[PDB]
Symmetry: D2
Subunit: 504 residues, 4 copies
């Protein structure tokens, strides 16, 4: 897989693939190359003409810095801003941030040199693993500086073939990549932006979209195991409560299948979760293709170098706080259906499906839902300002992105527990059969987890079914039975950006 970046076409799903698919590689388009060199020409003219421009050849102090002191300034910037702490990002997430960094630079408004972008490109393709401590950003100078630090051959680096973090200098020699060198503005160009929040957010919303579909598969199985009626899927019901999500979820369920609230009101609950995920997906897709640099370089603009606030991460921060809340509800209602499966008076099945069955598995699901409620608190609602700097308002979206991933990770396990329990319900109902797509899912689950005869170590089954869900095999199985519109695919193509009806 070789992806061509141009700063306009990147989707969260492609970025996720860039981080997680073996053999992923990036290149930049010819039009991106043209934009980058055009922007750099502006910078080179300002520096050569010894013209004073804040952010270009000024200090920290609107006076002109001498050339040699200007190179040293870039290095001091990268080093002093490498202030992050805690556990480093996983190799996949660190490399997602790297690729996203390159994509944003492709818009050609940072003033970066082409050769610096190439060294970033070459490092990615060679399999570099940046060392990015996950805590520090207030929304992403820190994370992006740690990225640039490794590209300077300083600090720590790893590789895909050897993920033990070691001397960055030796790793670059290992990969045959010459370290970057920094000219004017290159220091800021590399570390200004929302790429830590947005890369992590990209993974979150991708995983969220996929678990939203899978939640309906688990629900369908529970529906069958509990022997519920199809009455609540009547399209007349959802025609008169015509939210997009609710209608789409009901159609998805009808494809798979053609009571209690956790089943009967599922379209009315999954629906809004789906719409939140779809909305967040749109916000993030725009953000992955934004020029978050400062100051901005516009070679064809009335002003060639402009100071703005595009580095502020409130947009993806807010979106990720809401993603967590939306995804959380999928697990919340799922846990209740798990409760019905284990309850003998509710299921008309053997209790918990001298044996305890899936009793404690429901417990695990409830614990995950409970901790998700804490993670539902909006991190971006807080701002802590540095008084005598310029930064008097920040997004605090670093934690928004991380806890969004955690909530989805938790909900994935919850859905796995429901699906696992519901499949056992199907066993208990034999020789009864369910629908063709659901029988295929059941067989798929049974290929990694045998039916529950005697008690056994159940965390193994939970983890196996979770692996199964994350593999994509479950959705791939039911996919051809579902109408195209109900497959959650519309967000996979980049829409044209909003345009003012007046350019005033």
């Amino acid at each position: 897989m070789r992806v061509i970046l141009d700063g306009c076409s990147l989707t969260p799903d492609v970025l996720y693939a860039l981080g997680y698919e073996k053999g992923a590689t990036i290149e930049i388009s010819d039009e991106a190359v043209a934009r980058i060199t055009a922007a750099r020409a502006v910078i080179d003219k300002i520096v050569n003409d010894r013209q004073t421009v804040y952010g270009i050849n000024t200090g920290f102090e609107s006076t002109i810095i001498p050339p040699h002191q200007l190179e040293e300034l870039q290095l001091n910037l990268i080093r002093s801003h490498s202030a992050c702490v805690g556990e480093p990002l996983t190799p996949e997430r660190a490399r997602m941030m790297l690729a996203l960094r390159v994509n944003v630079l492709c818009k050609g408004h940072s003033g970066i040199r082409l050769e610096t972008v190439q060294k970033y490109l070459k490092a990615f393709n060679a399999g570099v693993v940046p060392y990015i401590p996950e805590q520090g950003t207030v929304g992403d100078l820190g994370p992006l500086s740690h990225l640039a630090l490794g590209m300077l051959g300083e600090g720590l680096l790893a590789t895909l073939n050897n993920k033990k973090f070691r001397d960055a200098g030796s790793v670059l020699r290992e990969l045959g990549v010459e370290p970057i060198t920094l000219a004017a503005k290159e220091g800021l160009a590399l570390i200004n932006g929302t790429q830590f929040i947005s890369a992590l957010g990209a993974e979150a919303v991708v995983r969220a979209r996929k678990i939203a579909r899978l939640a309906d598969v688990a629900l369908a199985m529970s529906h069958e195991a509990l022997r519920a009626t199809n009455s609540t899927l009547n399209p007349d019901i959802h025609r008169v409560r015509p939210h997009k999500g609710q209608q789409l979820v009901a159609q998805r369920l009808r494809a798979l299948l053609h009571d209690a609230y956790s089943i009967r009101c599922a379209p009315q609950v999954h629906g809004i979760s789906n719409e939140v995920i779809e909305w967040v997906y749109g916000i993030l897709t725009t953000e992955l293709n934004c020029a978050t640099d400062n100051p901005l370089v516009f070679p064809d603009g009335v002003k060639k170098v402009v100071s703005g606030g595009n580095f502020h991460g409130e947009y993806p921060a807010k979106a990720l706080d809401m993603l967590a809340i939306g995804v959380h509800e999928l697990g919340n209602i799922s846990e209740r259906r798990i409760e019905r499966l284990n309850n003998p008076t509710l299921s008309r099945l053997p209790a918990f499906l001298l044996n305890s069955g899936f009793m404690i598995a429901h417990c695990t699901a409830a614990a995950l839902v409970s901790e998700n409620k804490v993670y539902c608190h909006p991190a971006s609602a807080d701002s802590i300002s540095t008084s005598a700097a310029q930064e008097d308002h920040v997004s605090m979206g670093g934690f928004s992105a991380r806890k969004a991933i955690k909530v989805v990770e938790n909900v994935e396990r919850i859905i796995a527990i429901e699906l696992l329990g519901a499949c056992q319900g199907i066993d208990l109902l034999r020789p009864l059969r369910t629908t063709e797509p659901m029988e295929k899912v059941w067989s798929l689950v049974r290929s990694v987890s045998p039916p529950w005869e005697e008690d056994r170590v159940i965390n193994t089954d939970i983890d196996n079914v979770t692996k199964l869900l994350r593999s994509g095999a479950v959705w791939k199985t039911v996919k051809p039975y579902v109408p195209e519109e109900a497959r959650f695919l519309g967000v996979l193509t980049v829409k044209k950006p909003f345009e003012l009806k007046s350019k005033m």
Copy 2:
């Protein structure tokens, strides 16, 4: 203003007007009347043919006629279980009008005469007694509404808002109490109208304060003597979120390196605007939804269908997110208030008062703003994230959106005061900069503020000024002043027209 309801055309702004504008009246369309009687014909046939249908003439087996009526009354009474302070007259009447609108869709099976009575009571000026706590998302609130319509419990009127005997109040409006036939009990109390009516007020107030936030910001921008550099349309063209671009255009209209609270304002106000716009869309759909159960479809394959449209997760979730979005407007505004009071940051006299030896100026007003932001952070916790299964039976998941709606209103109420404090402080900044002038629209806003709050010479009781400027903002006079200077698209008006509902491409 006489509004004709038809269950398809109601917007949050019209509903807000129905509750808050003097002389508001409702009627229902001819097509709504037709739908209502058509649905009732289904119910009447079922009852007369003595056919067993769950939710129509069953029980808690077919219940005989003389007791089917008693069942309706028992339902209304036993479900009137709400506690706490009653809704304000305006909000109670908003819930009443919204109730009527939903019934106009013609899927509840309600009788026409009952709707007519709900209709007549509203127009006569009835004030329902609706305790604000109880719903898990809205049997309770809607039952209290129906209870008063039965002439039981408490009622008030617009002319006399002291809650008294409901029977005498109906006798005061010359209104005859409702009577309940089969299904009418459920038809009146099934739905999300408590959450959605309160939510309607919230999102309307939110939309208006979002616009006003940019006016306060513009004034602060002028008082702080900031550059227009960050409003360069090239900046927002390459970070092209709809909200960010629209906010920047709105600011360019009012004002035709700085701190982040000013420079990153389009990047912060923008997402707030988009959240508000999104919530507005969710709620507009919800105001025109058939949230009844069981549903009656006279032209359907099944005439009576059990579903889950009463579940309030949709408006509950939207209102939790509205609170978070609106909160940020106050959050960044408070920081700009901080800059205005800070002599190092403002290049103005400290706390916007000259002769600051004996005076404190707007020092403690900033304090009040900070306290409001701080408490908004607690209200930012999503209430709909919780569910307490009220039965090991069938009601095993609920939205808990009652508190989502109420705290959404509280956050917007708080943010309105914050924006008022910023605008008040920024206008004093303008005074301190005289004989300098600002733009034509901002000079008009300044004059408008000065007509309710004089400049700050010596110290005086400042909570009076804060409240006055807050009243000014809520009056609509401030936006009305700058409105003609702003491009139509940047006026936050697109949400005022009801879009056609989403339609499935496939027939599966």
Copy 3:
């Protein structure tokens, strides 16, 4: 009816009584009078000798006599910056009395005459106008208090609670308005008395509902016909938390495997009790603290000292934790309510009603309880965890405990209703079990409940019963009924006497 304040002996329960009991009056002790005049002598010397001391006659520069009086007035007026609904008369007057108590410690430098006028205003029945929002933790609220004492802004009286001109109200009461000398402005508005007065009500109500929670539980225990096995003192001897042991003993006194909401009740109520007891101790100290600045020490090495005793983090933190502790009482109670309504869990008629084919019983009452628990979870978020600083001042860290105090009261108010719903439901259970009888104290409670709420024969408006039983609980009649059956130590009375303050072992 007459409490003598001395700045050392005030308990939350006495302060609550001062605000809520009819005919309450305050006086100050002789030792307090002596301390006040001694401290004022220090101030008068400083001013007379024209000596420069920050906070007494500075700005910063030594302020001349004429301007020094004007400075006090400007201070009070400009700091009256609070917004929102005013405190209830009882809470406003609690803040007033607490203000006087703190001044009795004699470290504020206040004049005696000023204290006397506050004192006379309280006894005459003044109702201060104190907007509940604004403090960051309490210049605003305390300034609004002083503003009314100046005869400015709004005031009310106990005989006429309509807020009107403060000047006319003081004339009505026969109280001459205060006048302000040096330091008197700061002396009146420095302190944590808004947070602490509201907190005093909260922890008092919390302590009383903690006891009542065990009474409701005991009734539920009987209605559900549970075993006494889990009350075995051996169980709690080996899990010997003070609260758990005390709760179990209280339950044994009223009742002289099972579900967790009953069986683990000592293990859950226990920690709630201990949190309440801990908070009570924190607040009792705080009610008797010198929160002034700068502090005046007539017998100290330094007579006038600048410190940070005005910072409200201590009561703010305590009230955030009170909310969490009280919340759990309602949380576990709601689960017992669920068991009462559940036919498979209770072995009683579903929703505690016979002939439930037309009746719903207490079904929706459980719903109301669940909604209250759910909203309490939002209020459980610690408000004091946030701080918003004013960058260029000296106030770079604040407690934000104003909202901590208010939401603490809200949580307890909610939990009171929950306990009422449980008790109401459990008493119906007792009816359903007749001719069976329960214990002597529980039969008395049942009779007491039946005197305000008849048994549930047919369905009726249930919010009336809920409110009546809530009124009953708050009246104190329920606890008074079982009180003589409970061992003294299990009556939650230890906190009612002021303990000697902690003393350092070392002189360092």
Copy 4:
């Protein structure tokens, strides 16, 4: 480092040492042995006499054994990352201590095997998510002792086959008789062991917070006026007075400095209170049903397994510890602010080319901000998982974990303040501070050189954090501080509360 457990004497600090100090070993007292065998005699008598008692021989001798195994296996339902070796072994030791009270009905042989496994260096595999408050975690512990699932060792921490690890360690797997299954997995030991680490770390960072504050106080050249004992005598909270005395010991006007005793104080008191709750909890009989050989009823069903007590305490610990970081971050802000510090902006001379500690403050602010989310009480929620019995749970598993996270975050914040304040001292040379603070400064300078030109600052932050956690900083100032202000009272177990009345 051989600790003798008896179910009555364990403190959070000793338990922490048991998990983190090399060569730690446990034994049980003779009285504990006596109690265990006495309780087991009750259980043996019941099964021998074929008497029906719920929780002993309920739901034949043959299958009663199978029931125990099914119990352990089916309840091993936890997910996520496993506990660190130190925390897993803390849970193991705490498990043994609770069994020493002699009310579980466990066999002595089983305890000795747990005992032996610990001393041999076993590392249990305990997934950190699942408990609703701790059947899951305790079952995973027992699963490994059965030689099933995964295990590791201190010498080889790669999780592998539990059977082979026990062979490696020379430990024969446990066997389960009647009641032994429940005896091993009933309790609050996952919450309490994690909570023990949290409150220990909290107590130590509370002391260190005053050291950082003292240095900031010196770097900012503040007055000692706010430490006047008369101030705190008239606002006589225990914590506030103790903190002020601690500061006076180290030092013999902005709110973040002036109101520090009034803010650190309540944090200290919360930590001290939580410490007391947890100390009791470490020595509680959380079994069910309970066995009382000398009781009126020998086997009693109760609710001592309910973890609300430690859950609530840990939710409050997080809130209390959080505030230390909150006010510290504000002092960090003052250090970097040239208008507030009267020092070079961001503590760097020649700031035209250098940024100094600017972004380090940024890191501190981010940590405070995320701590605000963790301040939400996890124990405030309950999800009834049983339509009947288990209808209220504590949800204290996450309370314990996020408590550790908050303290971990605050440790870094304090490190950043101390690091910045020491640079302030450098900028003020040839000025000197007090003798104990000069020693702390020298100690910091031994792991982090002064800031001349810009360099990679996350290295310095991590080094100073390591320094704080090492105990060397407190050990340095310890002899200058009055005994009462050293936060040591909680280190000795107080006698348990006793009812006055016999009712």
